[PDB]
Design a binder for this molecule. Structure first.
Ligand SMILES: CC(C)(COP(=O)(O)OP(=O)(O)OC[C@H]1O[C@@H](n2cnc3c(N)ncnc32)[C@H](O)[C@@H]1OP(=O)(O)O)[C@@H](O)C(=O)NCCC(=O)NCCS
Ligand SMILES: [Mn+2]
Ligand SMILES: [Mn+2]
Length: 218
């Protein structure tokens, strides 16, 4: 029934909460990151890390702070990859072991039309044509946006480089899959090359959730 579990493999534990339950707290090492933050930001940060620590516990990893790096990226324990996302109505996290997957990214968005002007900023001309050809009944613009954000989250842990919206062509299939084709140099930190990702998506509870797993090499 959970959205993330529906779009990632079983060997990546996930956890999600739709509200901020009363009484949660950051770990002491995390408090400085939100010390001067408004309540909505404090809450999404605290609740998502509760979810992340629940999922880490399934992998056998005990309570640990999840700090942020220079580009905002979550800093996981050695040997762990993961992703976190929050929007109104959703906090969720997924983690996995580097011996079992290379990278994971997720992103949750409300299932609504994009704000005025956003599609023109984030979509390639060809993508706009492709979305207009998809079947009526789904906010394909928001899905494309969500999928591109997930593409960056799966890419960054492997490359330590920026990926702009114009740097990848995402093709959405109505069947709950998508692909991301990288249009820039795909050199990865370990010397391999990234060229394309396979993604999964689900719409439920008024939300879009997209996920990419970069699988283990053969
Ligand atoms: O909400 P969103 O879907 O936009 O995801 C935001 C999260 O993406 C993650 N994130 C931010 N920058 C990132 C990056 N460069 N690479 C991967 N994940 C990143 C963070 O965990 C952030 O949540 P936090 O600031 O509470 O840690
Ligand atoms: Mn968020
Ligand atoms: Mn998003």
């Amino acid at each position: 029934d959970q959205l993330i579990a529906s779009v990632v493999p079983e060997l990546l534990p996930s956890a999600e909460l739709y509200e901020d339950p009363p009484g949660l707290e950051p770990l002491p090492e995390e408090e400085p990151l939100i010390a001067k933050s408004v309540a909505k930001r404090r809450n999404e940060f605290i609740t998502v890390r509760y979810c992340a620590r629940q999922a880490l516990s399934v992998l056998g990893i005990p309570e640990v702070p999840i700090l942020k790096g220079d580009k905002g990226q979550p800093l996981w324990p050695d040997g762990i990859v993961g992703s976190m996302t929050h929007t109104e109505g959703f906090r969720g996290a997924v983690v996995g072991r580097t011996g079992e997957v290379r990278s994971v990214g997720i992103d949750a968005e409300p299932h609504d039309v994009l704000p005025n002007g956003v599609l023109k900023s984030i979509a390639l001309p060809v993508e706009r044509d492709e979305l207009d050809a998809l079947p009526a009944g789904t906010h394909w613009d928001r899905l494309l946006f969500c999928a591109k954000e997930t593409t960056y989250k799966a890419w960054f842990p492997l490359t330590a480089r920026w990926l702009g919206f114009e740097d990848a062509h995402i093709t959405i299939d109505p069947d709950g899959t998508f692909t991301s084709r990288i249009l820039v140099d795909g050199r990865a930190n370990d010397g391999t090359v990234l060229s394309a990702f396979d993604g999964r998506w689900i719409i439920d509870k008024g939300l879009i959730l997209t996920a990419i797993v970069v699988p283990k090499l053969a």
